[model samples]
Target: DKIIHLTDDSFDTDVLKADGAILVDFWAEWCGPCKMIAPILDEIADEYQGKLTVAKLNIDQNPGTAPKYGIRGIPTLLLFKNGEVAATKVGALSKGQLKEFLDANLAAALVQQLPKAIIIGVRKGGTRALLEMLNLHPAVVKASQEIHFFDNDENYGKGIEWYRKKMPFSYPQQITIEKSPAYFITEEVPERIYKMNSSIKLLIIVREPTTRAISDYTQVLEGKERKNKTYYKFEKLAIDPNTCEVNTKYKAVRTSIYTKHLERWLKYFPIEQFHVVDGDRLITEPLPELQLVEKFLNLPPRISQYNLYFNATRGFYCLRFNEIFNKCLAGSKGRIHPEVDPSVITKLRKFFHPFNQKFYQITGRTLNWP
Candidate 1:
């Protein structure tokens, strides 16, 4: 349809009771960019004929409607869909940027408002790899960062609606994904996630406890996480001075207690909702493992050896677009962990044996571990 000229008198008739999606430009006579974006909005109206309706209302001429909808600026644009205000934007946008905004919001309007899946725990465990692998498929839309909504009391208190807003705009067919390593260990997280959406799928990636602890420690030291110029060694932080035993109080050791942690999650969610990934297996052969993940998420087996290959120079696998334009992960991803003594490894293994056994019993799967 052609761009409709909306007035104060015709506001309700033209926009408030519109049948489908309507983009109303709250513009004025004096705004320079408003004049510029008028043509862009016209082009969009013509391009998306059946899908969208474009209208322009002069704020000066339509004072009653502008203030009612809180239009403070000249070129404020409001997107109305299904007779409700779906989204609003201030200032002006280029053709490409405007199209992206419209496309994302329109797609989001057609879908349910909650995430279909989540990567819930095990810090430093191939969470990133799993995200990369799964998101390679066309039907996935994952958040850009670790959204610690469930674990963070401040964020969680804001409610599930707040958490949903944090997610990226997604279509009905595209599965939304989020990962927060803290959620695995936080006692309250599983219940919080369950309360929000009980049917949501959970993905947990785990590795040998000892190796995972060391890797976690390595990250703290290598990154600008702490202000200290020199920090204590891994053994010093993890072991008791007199007992020569792994300190249960140490966070690194505490996180490695997978069975203890998994128990917390299992209380709120059923076994069927959980899918575990072997972190070690992902490092060596990610495709088959990721294929299983795809099936778990009800996605087709699109990820294979074709889009992935081991980069000898980087000493790790890389995502390849082609032979030349391959994208390698950051250096922190494949860090060379500092070596701990054999005796310490032995003590840690013995410490984790019973715990590991319980983990295997609960999940009905075993890992090749010492």
Candidate 2:
């Protein structure tokens, strides 16, 4: 008998105190709906034998237990995991419905899970490079696309289960990571992420502020150029003509002020939970930077220097996954920056100087940015 017969006496020992998952069907012999799903449950018990235990409780026979669970109708299904009611369904459900219910609730035990670590932000800060390099580690699995779950209001409203479904399937021992550069600047992200998992490790990669801002502008410029539309020069947007000072309103410039965004995140997550990567160094010298990240994630060193090889023609590094497989980043990366007035470049660096110092202080690391 694959199914366990539960009396009021056995209910506490078999269901309430059991390990793993137990699906309890509360029913009486006379109920037609109760009898309808019996054969289906038997098949499911055999199919999910080791992972799930299917149990039957007669409402007439186990009268004491029915009232305790507020079981008003027959064939009510309660899925218990680690001695707690994980999910409950009332009335009879189709076999398809039962499978959906079991699979959805059993996800944490089965395969996919929410990320344990996230590469949170600094757009144009080489986030793609970081994610790609980290994927070389045997214990790390990455989501192929950026999941803007915490930062975007519409996506956030969909709930965490929707977000979890978007993750790549991974073994329980592996860590899953997703990257969305906007999360660093969005005010709502930190608190929402904290609510999901307060201890989640956060990664932020940044480059020299002025260069990063220019790279940011270059990407948008390329978009407009492709559409055959002209946009204002970086000098015009980055510096207000009337004020003759740095324009804080420029999004590219605002994002480069790392201190402001880091301050907001610091309110929700302790500094210890964050690991800062130098985006510039990652491009020129990736191995040491990646090694530091490996340590920060509490992962053993597995990504060897041999996994990366400099592509002299592309002027960037490409990944060597194995003897037979190799890959390079998408063509969208490594765009050349358009020339700007040298004075504007110097002015932006001067403006970012103090903010950069504060960022270094908070993160307890210094970069040679002039």
Candidate 3:
């Protein structure tokens, strides 16, 4: 017989004050080993249904329970006899290892299991990277498509009509999330997302602000953005910022002043709201950085090894692909040339000081401005 599963809503009757012996699997959805051990646990529960109670609890759902039991790791196995913990261990084990644990600790009894999860990504940035890693986790469902009901305020105006029209009707309650970094930088978007979700948790990729600017500039200069952005006469735009098309390429690719924009983002959200993994750090230490995000999202720890591949257009944008791809591609690195007398950064920081101070107050951290 398949034992009934337990989750956050039904915790009271399942683990805390339940009768007889129990082994609670304290885990989150994106955990790899947790997924690996899930079926084995379910089958184990099924086999010992009447004698031992085997149940699962999601840390992301019932987070209180995790810290309470001092569980600081993924795939924590907690054994209880008469509701008091007898033994606790972390990580995935093979059939023989699991069997030994069961034989030594828990008495036979029936306890069912259930799923719990919450994919807490706000979309864009390194979310794609995180999603790719999470897909390796067997029990985790990546929610491949968008389910963006939270961040977009334009859609909110249309009301129920919009929800029914815009959102996918199926599997609305599954532990999944969606977002665009564009929205995060958009005005009032952070607050709007906050209203929609108060328990705002996150994993942010803080690439060098200068690099982001260069990428934005290079794409526009190369006419990769669109027909509107195809033309960029830098000398002309320097004289008149408005004359250029909507997406004018900034000269900062050559003049590097990312400290200005970083100061802008540092204005609204708290630093703790994000994990702020460095972009360069990701390329070098993908596993450790990914582990941090999993820990942030309260997902699993181990990363499944997967080779990633991509095309030029996929990695970057270009004008008339064949024509541009043939050119010797230069990497966007190094500092801005020292010769140019640039006052724009100093000027902008003076104007941005007040906003940055407010940001510092909210985030409770000092920012480097020199």
Candidate 4:
């Protein structure tokens, strides 16, 4: 099966009206990076084949779709499943990154372990990739991906039951992961995760500020496709890091700045309990970096990392999505109506850099950012 080429006119019929997993590639012909991903898209189309329907939505060609979804940039990706948008990522992605996107946010993985590992967010980094590699380990169970508890308050009043109710009841395991990227942006999660278990090995990954913020804008655009939100509209609210509904005005802003909220997490968990993964390194070589995470979590090492290389694509250089999906059936992919900003990033970094430095000192190591 070939990756289907979709024009602006066909996005709705092909995605919104279709079933299974819909991978929407938002691109423009003139974009060099967008062009770079074209062949990758086709390869992914063939790999996912009947399981996923790949469609490329050109932003320049279809100007109308942007404001309708509150989009602000090009090359945004929207994963549609279960009649809702499940996942969103901006800019171009390598094949492995896309694989992690599905695995962490949308895809299903083999039941390999017992207890779950939670990777809370500040999205658009390596969380998905981390989740993918974690799922490969023998002693780990794949739970919910991108559970979004901060925005939805899914973990209220009930022990693990509140969180578990959101997942499929059929899956059995004592531990599993349900990562909500907004956890970093919220005040309550540290306590929530702390309350759940003080030793819940939380993992976080950060990227370069400027590029990370831009990629974040792309994701916001994909979500804004259905709403009138942007990074700018909610920039000031980044200071108010509560994952409450009243803060929906600031949701987009909260997501854009990891610098400011690193302190919020640092307050509860020590750097030792928290493992910071370099998203760029994980993107380039997922196995080694991921193995460290497995060791950190005290789980057995992965056995299938080598077979994945056989599924590699052109520029992405890793097995395509369908190959991964075929190997791991009952996978999921998706997008949503809410999210935040570019300016807040600069402002937030300035506001939080000192605290991050202090956080580093708290850990006896300096924080690094390029």
Candidate 5:
């Protein structure tokens, strides 16, 4: 039903005059390589039935059609689009290579769509993890890098079209998602994003405030240590010496005030548009958190327990795309946190308690932060 048999008399009408893209396989009865690729072509024809028309022309029988486009090789595949040969492939291609060839040739069918959903961030709150897990869904396409369009003025001035160009090419049915952890904290980002798409879905992942602050400090500390620069310890930076109180002045401490950041976003987007994930839970048990995110995005449940597995060596969950394609995050992802003084940890937690309560009240989800 899928493969079209073209004759010398019918080649012009069936392929050259075709309405959409048509892949015509030029083969002959005695060609061995042609027979080798028959099943693969059959599967492709069936899978891409509507989007593409797969036709076969026997050069032995349809002698008139072979020399017109210079088809001297057996099993030559020519893709015709709107009465012209758009692409041509000579010889047999493995299924994977064939798919890649088709995708590369038919790239016009894909579009660079602006993100429909964004992982707006609380830095060090598992933003990367959330984006990577969500990408496991077949319907989601992610921008690989953190596109700081909304947060950075220079990028923002480049305009929305420039931002859209940074997005990955995706099918119309698939949603594009880009993450910039800085967006959650940048004062201008909420309004900038709202102007682009007011109804866009937002995802926020949060860990315990004190732990998140410490993680933030640790990341900077590691960077400084790499350059052999002296840096203050987490306790010294997080606590003010004069008052012996939690230091609000520290940028790391300021970023963990989830309620303050969420409140800023709330002024632009409605509460219904936001979905919060427990970053701590995501590290320990990923499936449930992913399922909730799936639900929030209104995506049909596709990600499963089989897609994630705990790697004992890395002390984190690794992604399993298939039996052949499994990957653990980079070594830098699950870096060990430097131990902080227990008393200072307690003090910071106490200081964050009121803000955590406010965050729960506004977001309508209580977490076991202590």
Candidate 6:
């Protein structure tokens, strides 16, 4: 909460074991930028009371700690969350840029009051339904929008605190949640998410590849049409007519190759940290799937049929306990997708067969799909 000095003798006591998020600045008396950044750090120290501990150690005097951490320059900022180095900034930055770094890591570090569970990965995979259903439980407070930190390098670089700020505040007894389906396939996303909060629970909703591909394709086509922009017909974009092969390079096709992307995610997170939901089941019988998600996040079952209703007109479920506020998904909730030919569907199923097999092998759970 206050700016404290870290000496070689007190470093372990003040930082390693001290509670909450801590920022350590390694600086020397002779450095000009060190002097420049001093006031900025002080302002942040005061700004983040109870959430942050600002510790500045003079490398010029602290011989043991400086040499041990390999401090080669002055004004090196190390962000320590739970005694681990979450990030390092080597050079001086403008107050605005530096504030971004501080706020980002602080948001990540002070995550005990932030999201403990993230619905990461697989776009158009019923992620919103999962969020809505899970949040129906009294203990889950959720973010309203996808704060895409992992997939977007610009946002990721802005820091964990930046990501944390996007979260909705909740009581100590409640768990916060957010969903960003794009995080699943982004090459660098898994590692970045792991570094933020290694213990963070991840939820993934998976639809059968063939259907998933069609859904994605439909969304793109509708978006283009809405904007009055040129768009390719599904067959031209998705298939090689001569060979009857699905175009693996197409964005929709690429995203459906779940095993190809999950392999990358598995490298950074253990299978135990991930809970998979059958997206098809979620659409058909939402309550059972919501219960599974609740148990996975260690929350008691609170969502049930009573909290939801199937809108026969829309052909999808809506969440609301009261008749006054109809908390259904927005306009495009259950729009009918353009129909694909039976032959085209057959080719896609054949294409994804092997990929789906690999996904089952990796996840250890087989989905019921034709």
> Which prediction has the highest lDDT against the true structure?
2
Which parts of model 5 are misplaced by more than 4 Å? 1-108
Best by TM-score: 5
Which sections of candidate 2 miss by over 4 Å?
1-110
Residue lDDT tens for model 1, 234-311: 888888989999889989999989989888888889989999998898888888788888888875344658778889
Question: Residues 255-364, candidate 3, lDDT per residue (tens digit)?
Answer: 22323333444454455555545444554455566566656655433242332222354343111111223221134322232221144434434534564455345444
Q: Who is ahead in TM-score, 4 or 5?
A: 5
How far does residue 284 in candidate 2 sit from its true spot (Å)? 0.7
Off by over 4 Å in 1: 1-113, 224-228, 321-325
RMSD of each: 14.1, 13.9, 13.5, 21.2, 10.8, 15.8
What's model 1's TM-score? Answer: 0.69
Query: What ranking of all candidate models by TM-score puts the best one first?
Result: 5, 2, 1, 6, 4, 3
Comparing 1 and 4 by lDDT, which wins?
A: 1
Q: Which should have the higher TM-score, number 1 or number 3?
A: 1
Least accurate 10 contiguous residues by lDDT in model 3: 317-326
Pairs that collide in candidate 1 are none
lDDT of 2 by residue, 1-370 (tens): 5577889887777777655578999988899988999988988886764467788988787789988877888879999886799899988888888998897877444478799899998899999999999999766889999999988889999999999999998755468999999999998999999999999999999999999999999999999999999998999999999988999999999999999999999999999999999999999999999999988987645588789999999999999976878999999999988999999999999999999999999999898897
The worst-scoring run of ten residues by lDDT in candidate 1 lies at 106-115
Q: Please give, for residues 98-171, the per-residue lDDT of candidate 4 as tens digits.
A: 77776576443323332355677647775665565565543344565566654456446544665656664322
Model 6 TM-score is: 0.68
State in Å the error of residue 263, model 2: 0.5
Mind sharing the TM-score for model 2? 0.71
What's the CA error at residue 93 for candidate 1, in Å?
34
Tens digit of per-residue lDDT, candidate 5, span 126-244: 98888988998766888999999988899999999999999998765578999899999899999999999999999999999999998898889889999999999899998999999
Ranked by lDDT, top first: 2, 5, 1, 6, 4, 3
Q: After superposition, how far is residue 69 of candidate 1 from its true place, in Å?
A: 50
TM-score of 5: 0.73
Show where candidate 4 strays beyond 4 Å. 1-116, 165-174, 225-259, 303-307, 310-368
Q: Clashing residue pairs, candidate 3? A: 5-113, 31-300, 49-110, 51-108, 51-109, 52-108, 52-109, 52-110, 53-109, 53-111
lDDT of 6 by residue, 274-370 (tens): 8888898888888888887877876534466778888888788888844565688878656677878888888888888888888888887789676
